[PDB]
Design a protein around this ligand. Structure first.
Ligand SMILES: Nc1nc2c(ncn2[C@@H]2O[C@H](COP(=O)(O)OP(=O)(O)CP(=O)(O)O)[C@@H](O)[C@H]2O)c(=O)[nH]1
Ligand code: MET
Ligand SMILES: [Mg+2]
Ligand SMILES: [Zn+2]
Lengths: 249, 77, 396
RNA sequence: AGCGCCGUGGCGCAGUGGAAGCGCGCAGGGCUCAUAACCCUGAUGUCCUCGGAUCGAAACCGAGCGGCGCUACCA
C-alpha cells in the first residue's frame, strides 16, 4: 500500500513546493493527486496554469505525469489543497525535482520491507521516520553512512532486524587523476613500479607511456582527494631523486 | 563522413569552412525564402528555408563551396 | 634470425607492402588511422623464409609434387620503405640500413616514374648496386605492351651505376613466380662481409613504446627499439649507450643495460649482424614513445663515440634534379641556407658555414656522433619540400 | 588489445529504478468557402542478450554482444 506520507505530517504546510501527478480535468482546472505529500487531492486553477496563453490545455498538463508546482493555501480541517504552478523560481525548480526524487527513493526503500514481511507499511514507516528525515537532512546521506558505518538505523528500534537486513541486502564514487611522466633518466620504470606498489597497497591504471590514471573508489569524496595527493607526492618524491621528473595537472 | 542531406526544407550536414551568417545572407536573397539557423544540440546543424526549391538549393550549394556533388542525396519527401 | 637486410622501393600507388606480404607473409600494420590509405610514416617490417629445394614459403615442401622437402638455406629480413615525396629522411635511413634492393616499375603509367628513379639514385648513392628490377604490374599489360615496357626499361637503364639489374615479373595478388624472386635474391645478392673482426656498433631507426594499457603497472616492460648492426655480434649481458641522447641547445648521452634481444621470432642471446633486431633495454618508454629513436647511433660500452656539431664534409652533386616529372638544373650551394644532411640515418638539417666546390663545413642544430665514415645524403628546399641534390661524407 | 559512450518507434532525446517514455515525423479528423497555420486522435518496438537483488523492472549492478574516442600498434 503506497501510503504513509514521506515527511513528518500528512497535511502540507504553507507556500510549500511540490511535484504533482495529474489524473483528470473536469472543466475549470484540475484537482489532481500529489506524490510529494499525502495523497489528498490538490487543485490547480487555469488562471495559474500556463506561462504561455491558454489555447491548448492537453499538452501543458500532460495528464499522468510529474509536474513541478507550489501549494498556496492548505485546508487541514477536512482536506482541500490550493495548488499553484506558475510562481516557481527557475532555480527552485531544481530544488523541487531533487526533493521529489529523494522522497521517491525513500518510498522505494521503505516498501520492500512492508511487502517482504506483509506488516503495515504505515507502522514501519512511522517507526523509521523519526531518525530518518528530521535528524539534520535527507535520508539518503544517513543510509550511505550506515552502509559504510551503521549508525542511523540504531537511533530508534525498528519492529525487527529481518526487514532492515533485507534493506541492507538490497542496497548491497570513482575519482580520476592524471600523472604525466616527463622523465629523461635511464632507469625510471623501476621507480614507477616501486611507487605504485607502495601506493596500491586504491585503483591506479595505465593509459600511455607518461600518462598514469588513478581512479580511486573513494567513499567520502574527500578521503579520495587526500589519498590522491598523497600518491602524487609519493610519485614526485620517488621520481625527483633517481634522475627523472614528473608532473601532475 | 561529412554527409549532407535535405529534407522537406532543412539542410542537415554543413561544412564549417565558411561563416554561417554569410551563408544565410546569400541564401535568403538567392532563394527568396524565410531563413533559419537552428542549432539543435548535437544533430546535423539545421539551416531551414521554405518552399520546394531543391534544384535551387543544389544551385546554392554549388555556388557556395560545393565541388563534389556526389555525397548529396536529397530525399524527395 | 636475419643475415642480410633487403628493401623495396617503388612509386606512389604502385604496390610494395602487399608484394612483400606475398614474399614474406607478415602483415604491414600501416597504423595511426591515417597511414592506411595515403602513405606511411614509420618503416614497414617483414621476415622471409628461404628453404631451397634442389631435387619456398614453408620449411617442408609439398607443392612441387615430389614429397621431398627443402633444407635451411637463408632467412632474410625485409624493410619496407615508403617511396613518397613528403618523407625522405626515413627513406635514406632505411637505404643506409638495407643491403639488397628491389625496385618496382609500373607499365601502363608513365614509364619514368619520378620516385622510382629518385630512389634508384638514392640506392646508387649509398653503395647499393645489386638491384632487381621488378615489373610490379603484369596482369594489367598486353604482351606487346609488356615488350614495349621491357625495351623502355632497358633503354632507360643502360649507363647508370646499377648496370647489372635482372628483371622479374611479380604481382601483389596472384602469388606466383615467387620462387624466382627468392632464387635471384640468393644468387645475385651475397651477404656483405660481417664477422667478429670489426668492433660492434648499432643504428636504431625506430622507437617502440611498450606499456600495456589496462594492465597493472607493477609489471611492465622497458623500452624496445629496432636496430641494425653493420659490424660485430651483440650478446646478452652488456652495457650499451644511446649516444645522441637526451636534451637537457645541447644533448647528453643515455646509458642502459640490455634486457632482451628479439630476433625475428624470439629472444636469442647472440645475433650475427645484418638484420633488424629488437633491442629491449631498461630505457624509459617515453624516450621510445614518439619519433625519438629514429636514426640514432648506438655504442656498446668500451667505445667512445665522438659528439660533433661542426662537421667537415666532402660532398658531390649530380647534374640534374630528381623526383619531378618542371625540372631545373642543379645549382651550386649558397651560404646561409638550411640543408638537410642525413648521416646514414640521422634527421638533422644543418647550416652551411663554409662553401667550396667539393668541400663544406656544416653545423647541426642537434649534435651527432661520428665513428668511422657514416655515409650521408644531401637534400635542399626547392620544390616546397625536401629534394635530393647530392651525397655527402664526413672527413675529419 | 584496454577503459569510457551509444543499445530504438523511420528518427534525436527521455527517465531509467510503478510497466509503454517527449518532439519530429506519417495517416485520419477537426477549423475555414478553400488552403497554409492552428486544434485532436493514432501504429510504430524485442531501449541488444544473460543473470542477481527485486511483491514490482528497460532501469541499479555485474559477464558476454554490434559500433564509436583515446592509447597508438603499446617487442
Ligand atoms: N591489380 C594490382 N593492384 C595492385 C598491385 N600492386 C598494388 N596494387 C594496389 O595498391 C594498393 C595498395 O597496395 P600497397 O602495396 O599496400 O600500397 P603502397 O606500396 O604501400 C603505396 P607507397 O609505395 O607510396 O608506399 C591496392 O589497392 C592494390 O590494388 C598489383 O600488382 N596489381
Ligand atoms: C623493428 S623490427 C626488428 C625487430 C624484430 N621485429 C623484433 O621484434
Ligand atoms: Mg607499412
Ligand atoms: Zn580483390
Amino acid at each position: 500500500t503506497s501510503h504513509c506520507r514521506f515527511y513528518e505530517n500528512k497535511y502540507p504546510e504553507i507556500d510549500d513546493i511540490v511535484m504533482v501527478n495529474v489524473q483528470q480535468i473536469a472543466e475549470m482546472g484540475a484537482y489532481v493527486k500529489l506524490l510529494e505529500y499525502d495523497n489528498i487531492e490538490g487543485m490547480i486553477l487555469l488562471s495559474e496554469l500556463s506561462r504561455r496563453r491558454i489555447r491548448s490545455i492537453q499538452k501543458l498538463i500532460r495528464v499522468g505525469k510529474n509536474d513541478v508546482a507550489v501549494v498556496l493555501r492548505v485546508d487541514k480541517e477536512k482536506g482541500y489543497i490550493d495548488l499553484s504552478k506558475r510562481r516557481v523560481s527557475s532555480e527552485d525548480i531544481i530544488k523541487c525535482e531533487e526533493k521529489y526524487q529523494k522522497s521517491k527513493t525513500v518510498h522505494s526503500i521503505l516498501r520492500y520491507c512492508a511487502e517482504k514481511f506483509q506488516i503495515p507499511l504505515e507502522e514501519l514507516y512511522k517507526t523509521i521516520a523519526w531518525p530518518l528525515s528530521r535528524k539534520f537532512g535527507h535520508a539518503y546521506e544517513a543510509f550511505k553512512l550506515s552502509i559504510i558505518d551503521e549508525t542511523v538505523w540504531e537511533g530508534i528500534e525498528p519492529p525487527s532486524k529481518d526487514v532492515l537486513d533485507e534493506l541492507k541486502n538490497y542496497i548491497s564514487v570513482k575519482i580520476r587523476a592524471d600523472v604525466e611522466v616527463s622523465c629523461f633518466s635511464y632507469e625510471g620504470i623501476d621507480a614507477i613500479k616501486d611507487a605504485l606498489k607502495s601506493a596500491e597497497d586504491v585503483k591506479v591504471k595505465l593509459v600511455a607511456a607518461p600518462l598514469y590514471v588513478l581512479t580511486t573508489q573513494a567513499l567520502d569524496k574527500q578521503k579520495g582527494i587526500e589519498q590522491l595527493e598523497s600518491a602524487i607526492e609519493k610519485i614526485t618524491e620517488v621520481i625527483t631523486k633517481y634522475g627523472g621528473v614528473c608532473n601532475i595537472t | 563522413s561529412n554527409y549532407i542531406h535535405i529534407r522537406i526544407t532543412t539542410v542537415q550536414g554543413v561544412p564549417e569552412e565558411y561563416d554561417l551568417k554569410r551563408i544565410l545572407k546569400v541564401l535568403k536573397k538567392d532563394f527568396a525564402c524565410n531563413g533559419n539557423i537552428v542549432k539543435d544540440p548535437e544533430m546535423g546543424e539545421i539551416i531551414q528555408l521554405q518552399g520546394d526549391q531543391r534544384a535551387k538549393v543544389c544551385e546554392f550549394m554549388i555556388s557556395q563551396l560545393g565541388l563534389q556533388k556526389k555525397n548529396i542525396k536529397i530525399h524527395g519527401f | 634470425q636475419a643475415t642480410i637486410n633487403i628493401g623495396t622501393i617503388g612509386h606512389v600507388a604502385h604496390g610494395k607492402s602487399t608484394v612483400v606480404r606475398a614474399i614474406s607473409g607478415v602483415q604491414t600494420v600501416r597504423f595511426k588511422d591515417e597511414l592506411e590509405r595515403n602513405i606511411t610514416i614509420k618503416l614497414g617490417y617483414a621476415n622471409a623464409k628461404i628453404y631451397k629445394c634442389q631435387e619456398e614459403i614453408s620449411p617442408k615442401c609439398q607443392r612441387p609434387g615430389c614429397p621431398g622437402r627443402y633444407k635451411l638455406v637463408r632467412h632474410v629480413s625485409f624493410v619496407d620503405c615508403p617511396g613518397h615525396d613528403i618523407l625522405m629522411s626515413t627513406m635514406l635511413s632505411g637505404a643506409a640500413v638495407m643491403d639488397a634492393a628491389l625496385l618496382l616499375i609500373a607499365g601502363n603509367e608513365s614509364c619514368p616514374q619520378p620516385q622510382t628513379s629518385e630512389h634508384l639514385a638514392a640506392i646508387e648513392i649509398m653503395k647499393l648496386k645489386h638491384v632487381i628490377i621488378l615489373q610490379n604490374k603484369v596482369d594489367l599489360m598486353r604482351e606487346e605492351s609488356a615488350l614495349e615496357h621491357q625495351k623502355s626499361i632497358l633503354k632507360f637503364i643502360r649507363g647508370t651505376i646499377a648496370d647489372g639489374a635482372p628483371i622479374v615479373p611479380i604481382s601483389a595478388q596472384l602469388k606466383y613466380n615467387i620462387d624466382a624472386v627468392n632464387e635471384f635474391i640468393v644468387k645475385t645478392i651475397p651477404v656483405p662481409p660481417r664477422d667478429f673482426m670489426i668492433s660492434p656498433r648499432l643504428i636504431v631507426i625506430r622507437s617502440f613504446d611498450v606499456n600495456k594499457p589496462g594492465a597493472e603497472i607493477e609489471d611492465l616492460k622497458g623500452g624496445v627499439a629496432g636496430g641494425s648492426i653493420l659490424n660485430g655480434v651483440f650478446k646478452l649481458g652488456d652495457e650499451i649507450e644511446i649516444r645522441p641522447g637526451i636534451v637537457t641547445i645541447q644533448c647528453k648521452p643515455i646509458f642502459s643495460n640490455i634486457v632482451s634481444l628479439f630476433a625475428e621470432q624470439n629472444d636469442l642471446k647472440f645475433a650475427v649482424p645484418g638484420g633488424l633486431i629488437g633491442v629491449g633495454t631498461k630505457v624509459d618508454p617515453t624516450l621510445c614513445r614518439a619519433d625519438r629513436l629514429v636514426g640514432q647511433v648506438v655504442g656498446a660500452k668500451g667505445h667512445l663515440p665522438n659528439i660533433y656539431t661542426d662537421i667537415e664534409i666532402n660532398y658531390f652533386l649530380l647534374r640534374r634534379l630528381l623526383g619531378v616529372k618542371k625540372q631545373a638544373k642543379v645549382r651550386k650551394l649558397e651560404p646561409n641556407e638550411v640543408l638537410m644532411v642525413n648521416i646514414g640515418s640521422t634527421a638533422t638539417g644543418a647550416r652551411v658555414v663554409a662553401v667550396k666546390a667539393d668541400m663544406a663545413r656544416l653545423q647541426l642544430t642537434s649534435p651527432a656522433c661520428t665513428e668511422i665514415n657514416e655515409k650521408i645524403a644531401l637534400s635542399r628546399r626547392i620544390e616546397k619540400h625536401w629534394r635530393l641534390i647530392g651525397w655527402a661524407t664526413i672527413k675529419k
